[PDB]
From a paper:
Here we report on the discovery of a novel member of this family, pyocin L1 from P. aeruginosa, and show that it utilises lipopolysaccharide (LPS) as a surface receptor, specifically targeting the common polysaccharide antigen (CPA) that is a conserved homopolymer of d-rhamnose. Alignment of the pyocin L1 protein sequence with other lectin-like bacteriocins, LlpA1Pf-5, LlpAPss642, putidacin L1 (LlpABW), LlpAAu1504 from Burkholderia cenocepacia and LlpAXcm761 from Xanthomonas citri pv. malvacearum shows that pyocin L1 contains tandem MMBL domains with three conserved QxDxNxVxY MMBL sugar-binding motifs. Pyocin L1, as predicted by sequence homology to MMBL proteins, consists of two tandem β-prism domains characteristic of MMBLs, connected by antiparallel strands propagating from the end of each MMBL domain and lending a strand to the reciprocal β-prism. In this work we have shown that pyocin L1 targets susceptible cells through binding to the CPA component of LPS and that primary recognition of CPA occurs through binding of d-rhamnose at the conserved QxDxNxVxY sugar binding motifs of the C-terminal lectin domain.
Numbering used by the authors: 2 to 255
The structure:
Amino acid sequence: ASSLAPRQVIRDGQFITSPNGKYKLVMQADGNLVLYEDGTKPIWNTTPVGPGAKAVMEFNLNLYNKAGQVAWSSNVYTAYLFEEFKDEAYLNLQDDGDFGIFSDEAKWGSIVLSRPEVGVKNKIIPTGTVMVPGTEYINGNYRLAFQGDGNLVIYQINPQVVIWATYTMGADRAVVQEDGNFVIYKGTTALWHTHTATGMPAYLKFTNTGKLFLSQPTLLWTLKRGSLSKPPKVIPGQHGPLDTTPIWSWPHDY
Ligand SMILES: [Cl-]
Ligand SMILES: [Cl-]
């Protein structure tokens, strides 16, 4: 995996790896968070805080010592840091060795929440996905299906119950677009869309609570670039089977 999920902890030799295999970010047993190139050359570090330490992804990436104090932080410069951002923000380590923290607000959803859902897990449907009748996703006790008949439906599985549906009868594809919109088409006729065309690539979140949301990447900070006041345009990255977050790549500068 090249990424860290909200609230994930790494410690005692656990690491992530860039998609090309060249860069490794490892939270060592001696308490140093170190970025390696080619498995042999350290190119950046926190410097060690000793045994018993860990790194956690919690809006910021924070290194904790054994006493439970924060000893190093990304220190993302932010107007507001609410507690639920800690449940949303994720990190990517990309192919030039930079690593970046994203925190993305729901642009559209199948339901309007009265408060954040605690401990929810999202199955990510990435940019460029083209759903075709017969496509399905399973997260927990819920199933997202783009059906033979063109309907996009969320079912509770056991027992089987319709939770939400588009009623896009006849449709033949549903496309998570580069422009930020999610659109259900018969041929090239648009039958339904999320109204989220902004020019920033879309992805969807399908939850293990039977909900679907669309979000767009919002890069706030990188190790090499610092804090960014406006989010640059990124492009979909190469995910592998252990990645559970969106994966992106970003250019070296403007
Ligand atoms: Cl360094
Ligand atoms: Cl996860």
